[PDB]
Design a protein around this ligand. Structure first.
Ligand SMILES: Nc1ncnc2c1ncn2[C@@H]1O[C@H](COP(=O)(O)OP(=O)(O)O)[C@@H](O)[C@H]1O
Ligand SMILES: [Mg+2]
Ligand SMILES: [Mg+2]
Ligand SMILES: [Mg+2]
Length: 1288
């Protein structure tokens, strides 16, 4: 390794591993070929850079080298051709750096000041002008985040230490108002004239110049984004002043329906009542996990991240999720996120080679990315945060829309060049923490979370950065705090978002009626160059602010240190309502303002506007046939199979997921809503649904809003809730404010829901948000061009659930059955702004709408009655794609056919099939048909209800009208058409061989779906005689920073009769726990250190390189009767500890999945013959299990080691396909493991490691699909019971 001076430090250069798999290499050479760059070869190697504050000895040096060996064992090559080194941009620090540096430090390498990584490309192309070489460089890096260098030694620039820049005053006293004008332009404050006036007066009054930092702070606080001027404005519309602001109209819903609401409009989340259940967590005093029977109340929030996603979609989506997760955690006095949702709206995908006939290239601004790039990288970013933080992503929407239409302002381009990137979620909260506490004078004011950098200030300022593992460490602290109940030391907590500390700290003291005084140099920073303005105002991620009483600081400090969550006390709350920021380094005072000056307002806005309303035009059906329409509609991404957005995101973490997107044996993503259990011990729960219908707003603003509320309801309706007043909404409003017609449209739509529909249904909207510049302008040759969004209301619905077991899905039964349409359209059959119109490049005439409020209410209540009485076999609502899609999706999910007659739905068959009016199809038992129709009739629905026919075994999808066949096709053929979008996305994003295997398996109708074979009685609690003695052996539930499934792991061992003890690696390191006291160990899953330096490696190496902790592990494993289990991240960890584990010499490594993608799957495995004591009695069983990993591929050293492993009989689980054979085809085998291997054991059988998560599926109710007759325990419960019985 290289070692040179880097200013006051030394920089070491260490060569790492080959970086690109063969299919990635081929993709690059293919891209070079298509651009006419004649490249003979390309090879890439990771390279690591260590900036050292003192030397390493030989032992330490060998440690560092070893830390930096990871990754798949790809073919290595001696370098050749021209070097192009890609690194993060100078002045930035990669999340990889943050995590890898933490590993070095936890391995005792304090000398390592910072680690960073690049990629060295070696390109052989002996032609190539220098012009072409810049094109080559351009293809190998992301211009928003990375730079390209010619030497390895250039990485020195990444570690330059700049001296702290001083505060700068803006010279109002010396130049007058011109100085504020100049600063406004120079610093991009975007101040209005009246804000310049207020600032000029405030500072004239104080008699001194404002500092740059004070102006910036004021500018961020008073932006549209932070102040919500539009939503608080007075309105005049068509000449008449209006009585309410938009905000007041939303609040009207709470004044009408306060029921169940605990908190609305006074926190960064709403809270509603949940259920009394067993809240499961480890006691502060014993470290033991125990159930605490108490209300688990339900918080909800939804946010957007639209602008940054247009610039840098991966971090834009990741931090959109990250911001939202902080809002949840900082609700009240601390709360716990549970499950998430995700939304995207983009322009047309225009997938190379898969152009669809409605798509036209209209151009875009150079400075934004394409719709395709957003849908490639954005969902990966959103999922990276949810996976590595550890909340399951259980529902979502994805719409594409880009067309030249005759809308409210005449002919123009309407679309989503600036996308919607939506993230939201639910969490749980204790009753006594729902209310923010008061801030005592002298309260310590703390920043919890990550060291700041210059983020948020070619738009580099919109390039965000995510570190989910940092946020997980913070959440653990928050959890520790709320888990102390009455001794929770958190007095007040708030997230840090827009404006950074300059917004969050003033907001916090002000919400408590206090001031604060702050010390700039107490704030944690990874960028010593930063000005006070940059420190105070940057939008660095994973930070929270809180207030704690001075006498609780020692407790807080203990809590943070055990979690490894960084924190700093940065000031004190004062009685005086003044804000002071001091700088110890420059000995001065960057901020010194009364709060009333800083937080004082300009006058509220008045919007005086007028109504525009499109006529819109009858659908021209010249080129439309029913058959062609079916093919086109199934190819609209809006309609099409969403797998590329679903399997990339964990859907099992917490162990509380009852209903995820994937439905049935064939795991078809058509679930209409998400459902979680409230605890690990209850069937009470929570549900999430989304409704949205933006294109309708191009014809009718209020109908678009009414339909978003309506579809939220129709998506959630087959979940057992009861009173509709249990359902609470978030309303997120996206608009191009100021665009002609949109303002009046916005007012009308908000009124349509806030003043009319929601009050009439009894639906509260206790939370919500707005994004008001949904348009993009650019110059496109000669001309000005503009792409403006429709008004885009996204409704998310949230509800307490009475029994999660009674949820229906779209999965049709083929037992004797009746299919009934509930047509809440009442025969209007509207076709305007449908998927059908869109796919023929039209807007059409009149859209759907809520036709009858009482009937919508009735529909809901009748569904609730049918659900509760168990009278439904299946449900699927009608939305994009109409009845045709509803029926098709039900057939896909049931893996069957339908025989339906539409003669009663009107003579216009096209309109009957493709209207997107509210309603849906219920399936009931044939014998229940008359009673079900009677029930519906007593809710006023008889004329909306139509018997369609039946679901039948087979492959025929048949629609008749009297004796005419309207449409007939192979259900498989439709299902594979419907799959083509996700196929093409997967194919261009992931390993094409895997995308293609997954796609091609859909075309095989003989696939029997997930199915089980059990070698034992699932219901026999073999641990019960032991549990009945009341002797409860301990299990060390072992977690490292970033681990996230430790709670449900504990619960599984607990159900089997153990006392589950929380053992953090910090507990082992500080002697608080010794393994000598345990007979059982389990290393849990998650993303320890964000998987940086190879999944499980930092965890393992921190054990190996500390000799004491290492001896402790080794001793545990060499005892004669100890048991250990490693699951997922713990399997990876323990595989890196072979040297401590007897009988583990043939164990493989676990590396990047062959798909090159995180795989969240419900996969079929079989239990194989091995010594594993944890699998006793189960050999020959086949059943599905939760899978949730990116690095699960078994990799051996060579074939000799694979054969040896196999011959020793150590393989304990294998992936099988649905025909029951061992497989390596994807995704049946989700990772590419040879011989399906996904668990191995030791020779003595006492240690077992496995990639899947049995702890996530020990409850039948948490199995995405399961046989109907199972009781409460899944087969996987037997693992934990086998461990108990084995201990005796
Ligand atoms: N962006 C997304 N992320 C995750 N899941 C999504 C996303 N978009 C859609 N889904 C899921 O895919 C399935 C189909 O979506 P969609 O057809 O939009 O739902 P619906 O038509 O019932 O409103 C649903 O289970 C939905 O939650
Ligand atoms: Mg759909
Ligand atoms: Mg639906
Ligand atoms: Mg929808």
């Amino acid at each position: 390794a290289g070692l040179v001076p880097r200013g006051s430090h030394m920089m070491e250069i260490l060569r790492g591993s080959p970086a690109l798999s063969a299919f990635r290499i081929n993709k690059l050479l293919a891209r070079f070929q298509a651009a006419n760059l004649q490249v003979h070869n390309i090879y890439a190697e990771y390279v690591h850079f260590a900036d050292l504050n003192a030397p390493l000895n030989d032992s330490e040096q060998a440690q560092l080298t070893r830390l930096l060996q990871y990754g798949p064992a790809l073919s290595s090559h001696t370098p050749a051709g021209k070097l192009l080194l890609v690194t993060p941009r100078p002045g930035t620090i990669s999340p990889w750096s943050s995590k890898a540096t933490d590993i070095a430090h936890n391995c005792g390498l304090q000398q390592v000041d910072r680690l960073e990584r690049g990629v060295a490309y070696y390109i052989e192309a002996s032609t190539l002008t220098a012009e072409q070489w810049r094109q080559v460089a351009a293809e190998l890096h992301d211009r928003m985040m990375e730079t390209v260098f010619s030497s390895l030694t250039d990485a020195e620039k990444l570690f330059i230490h700049h001296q702290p820049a001083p505060v700068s005053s803006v010279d109002l006293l010396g130049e007058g108002r011109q100085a504020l004008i100049d600063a406004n332009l120079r610093l991009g404050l975007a101040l209005a004239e009246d804000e310049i006036d207020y600032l000029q007066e405030a500072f004239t009054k104080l008699g001194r110049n404002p500092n740059d930092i004070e102006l910036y702070m004021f500018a961020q606080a008073n932006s549209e984004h932070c102040r919500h001027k539009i939503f608080n404005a007075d309105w005049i519309i068509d000449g008449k002043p209006q009585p309410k602001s938009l905000f007041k109209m939303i609040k009207n819903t709470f004044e009408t329906t306060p029921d169940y609401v605990l908190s609305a409009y006074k926190d960064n989340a709403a809270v509603m009542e949940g259920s009394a259940v067993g809240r499961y967590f480890a006691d502060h005093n014993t470290g033991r996990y125990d159930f605490h029977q108490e209300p688990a109340h339900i918080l909800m929030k939804v946010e957007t991240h639209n602008h940054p996603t247009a610039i840098s979609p991966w971090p834009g989506a990741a931090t959109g999720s990250g911001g939202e997760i902080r809002d949840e955690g900082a609700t009240g006095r601390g709360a716990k996120p549970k499950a998430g949702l995700v939304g995207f709206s983009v322009s047309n995908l225009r997938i190379p080679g898969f152009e669809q006939p409605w798509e036209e290239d209209f151009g875009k601004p150079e400075r934004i990315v394409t719709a395709l790039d957003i849908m490639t990288e954005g969902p990966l970013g959103g999922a990276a945060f949810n996976n590595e933080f550890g909340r399951p992503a259980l529902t979502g929407y994805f719409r594409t829309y880009e067309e030249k239409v005759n809308s409210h302002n005449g002919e123009e381009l309407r679309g989503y060049h600036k996308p919607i990137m939506l993230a939201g979620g639910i969490g749980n909260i204790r009753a006594d923490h729902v209310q923010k506490g008061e801030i005592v004078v002298g309260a310590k004011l703390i920043v919890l979370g990550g060291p700041a950098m210059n983020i948020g200030l070619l738009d580099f300022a919109s390039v965000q950065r995510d570190n989910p593992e940092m946020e997980r460490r913070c959440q653990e602290v928050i959890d520790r705090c709320w888990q102390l109940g009455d001794a929770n030391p958190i007095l007040f907590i708030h997230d840090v978002g827009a404006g950074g500390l300059s917004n969050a700290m003033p907001e916090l003291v002000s919400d408590g009626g206090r001031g604060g005084k702050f010390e700039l140099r107490d704030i944690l920073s990874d960028e010593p160059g930063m000005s006070p303005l940059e420190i105070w105002c940057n939008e660095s991620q994973e930070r929270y602010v809180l207030a704690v009483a001075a006498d609780q600081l020692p407790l807080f400090d203990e809590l943070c240190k055990r979690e490894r969550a960084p924190y700093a006390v940065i000031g004190d709350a004062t009685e005086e309502q003044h804000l002071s920021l001091h700088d110890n380094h420059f000995d001065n005072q960057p901020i010194d303002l009364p709060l009333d000056v800083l937080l004082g307002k300009t006058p509220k806005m008045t919007r005086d506007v007028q109504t525009l309303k499109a006529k819109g035009d009858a659908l021209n059906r010249a080129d439309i046939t029913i058959a062609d329409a079916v093919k086109r509609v199934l190819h609209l991404p809006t309609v099409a199979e969403k797998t590329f957005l679903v399997t990339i995101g964990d859907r099992t973490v917490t162990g509380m997921v009852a209903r995820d997107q994937m439905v049935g044996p064939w795991q078809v993503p058509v679930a209409d809503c998400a459902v979680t259990t409230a605890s690990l011990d209850s069937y009470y729960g929570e549900a999430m649904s989304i409704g949205e219908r933006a294109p309708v707003a191009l014809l009718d603003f209020a109908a678009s809003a009414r339909l978003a509320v309506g579809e939220a309801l129709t998506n959630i309706a087959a979940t057992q809730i009861g009173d509709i007043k249990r359902i609470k909404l978030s309303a997120n409003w996206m608009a191009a404010a100021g665009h002609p017609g949109e303002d009046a449209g916005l007012y009308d739509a908000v009124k349509a829901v806030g003043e009319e529909l929601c009050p009439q249904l009894g639906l509260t909207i206790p939370v919500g948000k707005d994004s008001m510049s949904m348009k993009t302008r650019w110059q496109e040759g000669n001309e000005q061009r503009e792409m403006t969004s429709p008004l885009s209301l996204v409704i998310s619905a949230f509800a307490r659930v009475e029994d999660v077991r009674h949820t229906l899905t779209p999965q049709l039964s083929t037992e004797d059955n009746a299919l009934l349409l509930i047509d809440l359209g009442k025969g209007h059959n509207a076709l305007g702004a449908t998927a059908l119109a869109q796919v023929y490049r039209q807007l059409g005439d009149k859209p759907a709408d809520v036709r009858d409020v009482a009937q919508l209410k009735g529909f809901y209540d009748a569904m609730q009655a049918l659900v509760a009485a168990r009278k439904l076999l299946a449900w699927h609502d009608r939305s994009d794609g109409g009845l045709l899609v509803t029926l098709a999706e039900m057939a896909f999910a049931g893996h069957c056919g339908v025989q339906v007659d539409i003669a009663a739905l009107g003579d216009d068959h096209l309109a009957a099939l493709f209207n997107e009016e509210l309603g849906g199809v219920i399936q009931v038992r044939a014998e229940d048909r008359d009673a079900v129709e009677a029930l519906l009739a007593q809710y006023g629905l008889a004329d909306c209800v139509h018997y369609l026919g039946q679901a039948l075994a087979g492959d025929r999808f048949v629609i008749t009208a009297n004796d005419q066949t309207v449409f007939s096709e192979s259900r498989t053929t439709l299902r594979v058409w419907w799959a083509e979008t996700t196929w093409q996305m997967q194919r261009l994003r992931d390993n094409p061989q895997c995308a293609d295997q997954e796609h091609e398996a859909k075309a095989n109708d003989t696939d029997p779906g997930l199915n089980v074979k059990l070698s034992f009685d699932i219901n026999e609690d073999i641990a019960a005689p032991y549990i009945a003695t009341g002797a409860r052996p301990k299990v060390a539930v072992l977690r490292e920073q970033g681990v996230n499934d430790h709670v449900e792991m504990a619960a599984a061992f607990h159900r089997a009769g153990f006392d589950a003890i929380d053992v953090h690696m910090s507990d082992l390191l500080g002697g608080r726990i010794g393994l000598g006291n345990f007979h059982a160990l389990v290393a849990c899953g998650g993303f320890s250190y964000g998987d940086v330096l190879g999944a499980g490696e930092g965890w393992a190496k921190s054990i190996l390189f500390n000799h004491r902790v290492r001896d402790e592990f080794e001793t545990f494993f060499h005892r004669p009767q100890t048991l250990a289990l490693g699951v997922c991240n713990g399997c990876q960890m323990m595989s890196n500890l072979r040297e401590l584990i007897p009988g583990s010499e043939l164990w493989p490594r676990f590396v990047r999945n062959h798909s090159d993608r995180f795989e969240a799957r419900f996969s079929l495995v079989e239990v194989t013959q091995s010594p594993s004591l944890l699998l006793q009695g189960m050999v020959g069983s086949q059943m599905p299990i939760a899978v949730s990993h990116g690095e699960g591929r078994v990799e051996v050293r060579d074939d000799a080691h694979l054969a040896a492993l196999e011959s020793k009989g150590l393989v304990a689980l294998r992936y099988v396909d649905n025909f029951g054979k061992v497989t390596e085809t994807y995704p049946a085998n989700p990772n590419g493991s040879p011989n399906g291997i996904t668990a191995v054991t030791t020779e003595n059988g006492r240690v077992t490691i496995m990639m899947p998560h049995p702890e996530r599926v020990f409850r039948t109710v948490a199995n995405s699909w399961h046989p109907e007759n199972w009781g409460e325990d899944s087969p996987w419960m037997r693992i934990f019971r086998n461990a108990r019985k084995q201990l005796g």
